Write a protein that holds these residues in place. Sequence first.
Motif: not given
Lengths: 47, 320, 608
Positions: C346-350, C536-547
């Motif tokens: 994750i690299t995007r921010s406001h 699918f991209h989110k569920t496979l790439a970003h979920v653990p980092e958000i957790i």
Amino acid sequence: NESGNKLFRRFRKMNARQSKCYEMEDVLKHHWLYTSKYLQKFMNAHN
Amino acid sequence: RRAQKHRLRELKIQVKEFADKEEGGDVKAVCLTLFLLALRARNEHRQADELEAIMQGRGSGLQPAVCLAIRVNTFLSCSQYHKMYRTVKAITGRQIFQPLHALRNAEKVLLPGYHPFEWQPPLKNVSSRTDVGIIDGLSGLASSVDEYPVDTIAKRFRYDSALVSALMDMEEDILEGMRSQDLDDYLNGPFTVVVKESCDGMGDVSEKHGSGPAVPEKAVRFSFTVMRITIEHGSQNVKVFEEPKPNSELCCKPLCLMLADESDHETLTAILSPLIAEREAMKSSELTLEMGGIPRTFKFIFRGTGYDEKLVREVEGLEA
Amino acid sequence: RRAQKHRLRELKIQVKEFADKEEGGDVKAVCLTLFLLALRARNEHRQADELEAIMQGRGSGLQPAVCLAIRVNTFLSCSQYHKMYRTVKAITGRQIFQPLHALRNAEKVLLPGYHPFEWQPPLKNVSSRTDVGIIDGLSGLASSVDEYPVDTIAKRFRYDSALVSALMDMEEDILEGMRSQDLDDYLNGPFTVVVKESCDGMGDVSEKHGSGPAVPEKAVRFSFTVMRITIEHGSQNVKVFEEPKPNSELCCKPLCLMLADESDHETLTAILSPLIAEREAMKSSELTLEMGGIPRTFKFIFRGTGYDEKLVREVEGLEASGSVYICTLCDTTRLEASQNLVFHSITRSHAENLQRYEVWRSNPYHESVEELRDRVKGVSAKPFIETVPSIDALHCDIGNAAEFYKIFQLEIGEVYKHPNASKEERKRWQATLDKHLRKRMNLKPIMRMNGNFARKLMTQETVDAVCELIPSEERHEALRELMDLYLKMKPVWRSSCPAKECPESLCQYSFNSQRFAELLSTKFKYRYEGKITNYFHKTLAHVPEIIERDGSIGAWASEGNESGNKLFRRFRKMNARQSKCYEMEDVLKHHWLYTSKYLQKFMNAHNA
DNA sequence: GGTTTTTGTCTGGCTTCACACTTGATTTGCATCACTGTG
DNA sequence: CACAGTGATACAGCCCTTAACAAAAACCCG
DNA sequence: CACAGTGATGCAAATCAAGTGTGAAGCCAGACAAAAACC
DNA sequence: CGGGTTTTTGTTAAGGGCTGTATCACTGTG
Ligand SMILES: [Ca+2]
Ligand SMILES: [Ca+2]
Ligand SMILES: [Zn+2]
């Protein structure tokens, strides 16, 4: 009968069991209860 | 409780042995009277009135008919009413509202299939049982794999039982109407009742998931309304009860609810024919009902006005 | 009263002599206990309790707070409550319920704009008044015929007033938390409050008649809920509160409501600018508020998660949802997401979006449209709402279930052997799949898929019923293993505490994700060669980092805002004035009263 | 006519509730207002 | 793992009767 | 001329709180004395 | 100090009756 249709629509989701088998009987029963003068006259306790 | 029983083990014995002599053995009533006289000797009159009312269910209690009336006309569901009753009881300590099973027991007095009725002459092709309630609207239609497929759900009342319940719901209303016209009270003349028949389909009713046939997302309702009740007095005809607001939702009593399509004709006829048969049988007979301590007889005339133009054309002839 | 003494004359004399020689002389009490004996032997405990109440202090009369709690939480309306009050009073005599005006006078204590408060650094660009309630959401926008036309109606609270009202509503919960955490009671430390902001547009609302602007038939709701409250002790912070049902309809508090189109950016910004202004003003301030005789101060940390994908794309300065850049968390293209599918960050921010828009507008490197978009990673608008990168669980589940439904449609025909197909064949596939789904799992065919459809379709019986229509067995085993992998992956981003109740699943999420990705890329080249869904991209790439970053996914989901949307129509039809210039105010107030937690502990007082 | 029940009273003395006035000070009731919703 | 309903039904729980027995608290006085 | 809501607002009307000295009513005593429904 | 007496409170089981709560496949905003 249009007002009864409105009552049917709102009783279908408000106060009837959600099941294809035994929902229509509940709607019929509750509508018969709501259209009863004996119950309605207790809501006019001003005399 | 146990200490009070221990201390008063014998006074109960004398009062119960004297109840058998003076009255017969009704200890509760004699003790209530004793408490009333004790209060009178202690000079508490408004309290005595309060006890008399609570015994008669006037000062408090809220007899289950009133609770059911509130729950139905207030548009409260069973769960919400249960929450209200539970919280009111928990806060106030007393039992102001009645429980759900008490309401359900008091419900059966108004639903069809509770009062005994006799037809004279007996209806053609209609059973004489007086305990018929919510019966399937399919009227025992075949549902096998070898015949016409049925995909509708329908629940309906018997016409005669529904009209018996409708007449008894307005029992006090009919008595008041007969009194207000300077007639008698126990008069048992043949009542000429006119009933308006109304049927209209609907659209955009969502189908549920769950067991059942592929039932279409349309509904058709059949209901009846009671306009006027007249009794034959003297030479002319006198009126008793007229509906004050005929076009209201408080007088369109449901009779048969089927969740099918009015565009279809086969299913409409299959579900609605028995009701027409019952209506035709009732058109040439008389009904006897124990109306407020005196048996009175009814005759019925029917008018099917509550139809729109499309249903009228699709039912009684002309092309759509 | 007189003609009944000849039957009690013989007995009351022994009544008094017995009372004198044993009890002491009391007659009323010794008769009362006897009558209670008779009643409770007869099993008439209701009348026994009534007699006990009559003899003791009378319990007649409810408190205005409990009357309001009943009238609100039983979904009752003012007219129905009035007639229920009338009939109950007229029948029972004594006045049990309370007048509507008493209920009205008792309800201002919880509505915002009644409690005194102040900010240690005075908030910029917002007044210091403490008696502000329901104000117009237009914030004095120019309604003249010479200006940009306005066609919206909006009623809103000040965000600080809403926060202080909610805090004083939860005062006693906070105190109970202090007691239960084994800390003191009079401590006045810097409370840290974490709130969720959720915004979702609605449709199919029916505009009313009457005078007013050309209001659209689309509505947008803005609401907030309180999740966690922490106070510092020594070197750590203790959790004094935690919301039990973060996704329920009882926790989301309405804050700003309007009848405006979601994508109508001009009026969206015009209405939502004041709230963001207060948000940024109070993000670096301290709130001093009186709590039960001891002043206490509050900090505030804000997390925005309750926005759906389209809302995030619109309000974060991003492109449409069908663009090449798919994820609102990382700068990767749809194709490159399809070849890699596993490793991301994750690299995007406001602030990064703001500076990317500044680069896009200034063009400081003298490049063309394509080069500048490749430089800015898809930013073409100026963001105006700050949200944290997070995944909405409900819509993620809906999208995944839709994609699996399409997979089943293409698999019940073996498109991997028939690369070309007509519209009629696909319609037949749709019809047979719908028919068998109904037959087996009792699901009706629907055009807009719900979440219940997702939860039921995400079962093993689903692939069983779908697979018995597939002639081959390789497809059977492929669908079976893929579905099992998805069901093992699901409980992580749907549970309110994925670090406690699903430890093995959380630890094996990475392995299951890699297996899912390789299975897609190998066995499903006819669907995911050069194109893959962003969910699918989110569920496979970003979920653990958000957790790891937040602590849970699904507690921050949009389920609460959806339930509030459900309540909005019911209140607009039953508990609000049917006029175009008051309905939104009435709905906002009634929704605030319903979500108020002071009326909620009265309905479960039976458990005390 | 007998028999039992049902009410009637007796006067001195006790408690218990209503009222006689007046001036504000609340608290309760009910109509207004332009609208929906089933067609 | 969305969570608060939706209503009918069935089972559990609790409180009265019989009557004699048992564990336990409050003064009295040697 | 459908009819039952939909809630905030506002004014007419009902209830009351303060003060003490009255009237009016209910009931206690134990005993004596007329109506009334079955034989 | 502790028996002795008086009283409180509970216990045992076969039945009756009122009240409370779990269970069933479903809804609805998406
Ligand atoms: Ca119609
Ligand atoms: Ca949405
Ligand atoms: Zn991404």
